[PDB]
């Protein structure tokens, strides 16, 4: 079953289901500090996206997972398998964008989207600043495969905004390097090539955008942009955190913020 292949875990109890979708380089273990604050009030569904190191490499389709849509379609199937409707979806980076795309096709499945550090496009254009220049990205990606570990280690302290020897770093690297190398490179290239901007106006479910004040992968203005271009109601909350995985590195600040967005609707 697709849910078995995605390591679906179900906990808690309640009329409303919260779905937790981890971001690049992590797995559902990233949510371990949030869960205790949900278990008494909600049913919670956790899953691993295909290609996480905890998933079977034989199920990784390099054609489907070279664009984000494959993840969105897979998300729908998982929610259907466990008969999940009008969920509160909480995602980090790519998973939040995957859910946003999914919600265009199946708005019935989503009550709201809570999005940690989302970005619809990394590469800069004349009109849009994503934080990365095409010609530099082209050089970096040309030698990505042979340099995956060294490039990833070398950048991770600034990506996470924490020291190379920190507990948060050790945890991130544990899951990042759990991915099979070819799979990791495929997912990395997919993220680097994202352009979800054409979808945004067609997203109508409520979106809660949670950002760090400084994130090398998400310029702070991307949050304000998300608000201006999403088709439904949205809220933007910039936190006094640094780093792209503030739920991992700064949970004392980030968990209370995430909880507020889960618990409090901006509609009805």
Author numbering: 3 to 270
Reproduce text from the manuscript describing this model.
Striga hermonthica is a root parasitic plant that infests cereals, decimating yields, particularly in sub‐Saharan Africa. For germination, Striga seeds require host‐released strigolactones that are perceived by the family of HYPOSENSITIVE to LIGHT (ShHTL) receptors. Striga hermonthica has a set of SL receptors, among which ShHTL7 is by far the most sensitive. High‐resolution X‐ray structures reveal that Triton X‐100 specifically plugs the catalytic pocket of ShHTL7.
We determined their structures by molecular replacement, using the ShHTL5 structure as a template 21. Surprisingly, in all crystals, ShHTL7 associated with the 4‐(1,1,3,3‐tetramethylbutyl)‐phenyl hydrocarbon moiety of Triton X‐100 that we used during protein purification. Triton bound to the deep active site pocket, formed by a double V‐shaped arrangement of helices α4–α5 and α6–α7. The hydrocarbon moiety of Triton established hydrophobic interactions with Y26 (loop following β2), L124, F134 (β5–α4 loop), M139, T142, L143, L146 (on α4), F150 (α4–α5 loop), L153, T157, L161 (α5), T190, I193, C194 (α7), and M219 (β6–α8 loop; Figs 1C–E and EV2). However, Triton remained at a distance of more than 8 Å from the catalytic serine S95 in the active site. Well‐ordered water molecules filled the space between Triton and the bottom of the active site pocket. The Triton polyethylene head group protruded out of the active site pocket. Five ethylene oxide units were visible in a relatively weak and poorly defined electron density, suggesting weak association of this moiety. The headgroup‐ShHTL7 interactions with the outer rim of the ShHTL7 binding pocket comprised a water‐mediated hydrogen bond (from the oxide of the first unit to the backbone nitrogen of E135) and hydrophobic contacts (between carbons of the first unit and a hydrophobic pocket formed by ShHTL7 V138, M139, and T142, and between carbons of the fourth unit and L160 and I218). In ShHTL7S95C, the sulfhydryl group in C95 was oxidized to a sulfinic acid, as confirmed by mass spectrometry, causing only a minor rearrangement of the H94 side chain in otherwise identical structures (RMSD of 0.108 Å).
